[PDB]
Symmetry: D2
């Protein structure tokens, strides 16, 4: 089955930033034809730690920008919703509706996404055990969702730290396709006080682990200049490094693939 | 004065609310030192299973809560799950409660603050104590003035919560602190035997109030059946924490 | 039953330091007659993080100093052992043989302590669940121990941090007398790199919690001048504060006592 | 070269060691790229229960280990639990193993280092990756030159261990890193289905070797019966990690 690579700037800082990243993702989609690329970017960071942090330019502007990306590059689109009413308007452009980690248990949000007929990707809550995602998938199926993904993005490990329990990949695979969030899994929640931290040096090794274990795709935030990002400046991958990372995981995936266990 | 937020987990029927309301009213008259607040959720919006009990809706809920405040003159508190709910809930709720999983949802916090009512934020199981400072700042920015932070356990491995009591003195630096005695012993995805022991710890450490779910027959509750406190045991526990508080308060550290 | 207060300098820095602390503990034992005091001090810090940290002046010197304390003040004595051969010589002076947290699973050490006929106090390993201490007590009883204590000293919570799960007090009470370690429970393992850290501001509130929940005693390291201690300088309680802390926990214990659950 | 430490958890009988030794010898000849080390404990000194299997003693153990090295010419490794054991164990053990619970016991580390042999320290479930720097320093101070640090999981709530793979690159800054594939999936006080998946992760991330407990019939093992790898599956797993390593090594980060 075609491997999924969900990538793009964390937040829709501007329609320009989106077209700049979209151009590169389009180039890579032409090179890595065995990969199904999905362009991602949030129209709103509705859960920043500080009230003073960047959130976005609203849904209207965001959907418009995302539609421009899909229109210009013919790339699939995914973005996250935060309240039920957003599912309908977002579904007009998003091929995959993403459910934020903190909201993975909000029944009405999951149901709102499911009835749009679009694919739904739920970030696994940092408080959730792998086996408890079975009910999350059940809610979605109940709500009409036919294409469901569960994304591993780390688990609460003491204060301001997340650990990735790779046992979660084969467990969740029992009831949904699994995506590994390579950039959020290394962030340090509220690590910088008014904002979260992160250790970029661990992004690559952990993503290698993910494909070695076996997953159906990877999620990576990428920005031309991470140091200047308005969100997740410590974890967003420099855009020029994307190509090399993807080649590497496809290589590791291939050699490890024959050993992937059957669920 | 010391706050005691109590009531049935879910509004299974205004009839149930009135029964629990009668007992809380009685205790209210017996313990004038304490400020009681009746609590009950009009919707369990985050159940693990799609087939579990959620409730009878916001309208039926706000109505039942109205009956309690009118019939007993008790302050009210219930939780909201989406921004639009803040306004209609504020009609009856003296304190608007923010769910633990939603403690970082900026719009929900702002919506609650904008109603002018008091806001009680359940500290997320993923949050460090010091990270609640920013939560308070959001509410203040939104015009909130009576702000509470509730300790309800922290993620400890899978399907388990631990109460780090160091959180009480830490959160007290920027808000009044409430200890959730019933959800702190619950096992995500709980043991009633630990409710009283940990509540005693909370008052010995020092907090501004306690939160307890109580039901005439917990075994038959449609929500938190394993942790809801039997109504008949509420008086004894309140008297107990008041006595412990009286002696221990002498040692509560300043700010 | 008489409440136990185990207190003293973390390490036997000198026989003088011991007599200075012993004098105060003796004074308090005369005041708090409802308390059973036990003077504690390690003849060896066998598990310091750094090879450059203070360990002690050897068993011989240590036992001699401890015997002087017992001789001069008539105070009961407790100290910890690290290898089986130490149980015999230590048992000559120690009324209670303490088993280090990291060694709570070492069968031969527990057995060595048990056959001396002395009381045995096992620090609960930071890796151990409360219910798993049942087997620890079983080993001791098997080895002849008649007076057994289990000490709560925190549990691993993420990196370089410990949390106290007070549910452990009533659980462990099912099979042994329970002691709360008020000073080690707030230490930050390897927090200072070459040494462990700690937050003294939390010692008092957590000890109040312990007696409110209910335990059979408390363990506190105290030093005339903590800032100058050769070990646990960040967590040892200033000696002048001991009296007040003890009065407070006896007061809280008394008012909470009628609510202690029966096991 | 890549290290593969394997063998039965406990020395249930030198007869068992010889059987496992024969297979490890065969693989040894098949994979010249790998340096195999036969492992087996002469004593399980930290069992939870007093009634569990410990072993046949140090003498019977060192004797059986001698038979394996002589009969197959395989390097040896076993763990010590008290200082006095270092010297006699060093007679046969090429690598002296330090138990996880004992990774901070200074005298045990010094005793092992003093024998001149290589020392492999199991990282305690309570240790942070960066805290192993001091462990290495102790061994160096003691005269050790071939030092290994083994990843075997970290305490995650109660009765559970999680493998934080960030530890591999971190510990590599001051020592060769070995991944314990069998104890990392064990549940303190485990699931065999996760052994292979996590070992693949370890080599994809980058390590200097793997540690695996293998037994002809794990179901009948007197120790770690739920996690010991069936002997017949060892060849397949080794071939698998060699292939993954070959491709992934290209991306291992420097130091
Ligand atoms: O959903 C949350 C995102 O993944 C981040 O971890 C989030 O936006 C980080 O927020 P902050 O830096 O404001 O803590
Ligand atoms: O047994 C260990 C003691 O309680 C300490 O936590 C220990 O001696 C601290 O050692 P260090 O400061 O050298 O890490």
């Amino acid at each position: 089955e075609k491997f999924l690579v969900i990538a793009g700037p964390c937040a829709i800082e501007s329609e320009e930033l989106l077209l700049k990243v979209g151009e590169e993702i389009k180039r890579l989609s032409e090179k890595f034809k065995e990969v199904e690329f999905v362009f991602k970017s949030s129209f709103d960071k509705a859960n920043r730690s500080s009230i003073h942090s960047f959130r976005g330019h609203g849904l209207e502007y965001g959907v418009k920008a995302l539609r421009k990306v899909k229109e210009e590059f013919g790339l699939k689109i995914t973005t996250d919703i935060h309240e039920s009413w957003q599912a309908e308007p977002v579904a007009e452009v998003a091929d995959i509706i993403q459910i934020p980690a903190f909201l993975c248990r909000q029944t009405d949000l999951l149901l709102a996404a499911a009835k749009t007929g679009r694919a739904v990707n739920v970030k696994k809550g940092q408080f959730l055990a792998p086996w408890d995602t079975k009910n999350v998938v059940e809610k979605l199926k109940f709500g009409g969702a036919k294409e469901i993904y569960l994304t591993e993005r780390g688990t609460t490990f003491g204060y301001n730290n997340l650990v990735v329990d790779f046992r979660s990949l084969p467990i969740m695979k029992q009831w949904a396709k699994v995506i590994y969030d390579a950039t959020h899994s290394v962030q340090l929640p509220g690590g910088l006080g008014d904002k979260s931290g992160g250790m970029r040096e661990f992004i690559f090794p952990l993503i290698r682990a993910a494909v070695a274990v076996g997953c159906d795709g990877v999620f990576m935030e990428t920005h031309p200049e991470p140091e200047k990002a308005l969100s997740d400046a410590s974890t967003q991958l420099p855009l020029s490094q994307l190509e090399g990372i993807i080649e590497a995981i496809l290589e590791i995936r291939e050699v490890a693939s024959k050993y992937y266990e059957t669920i």
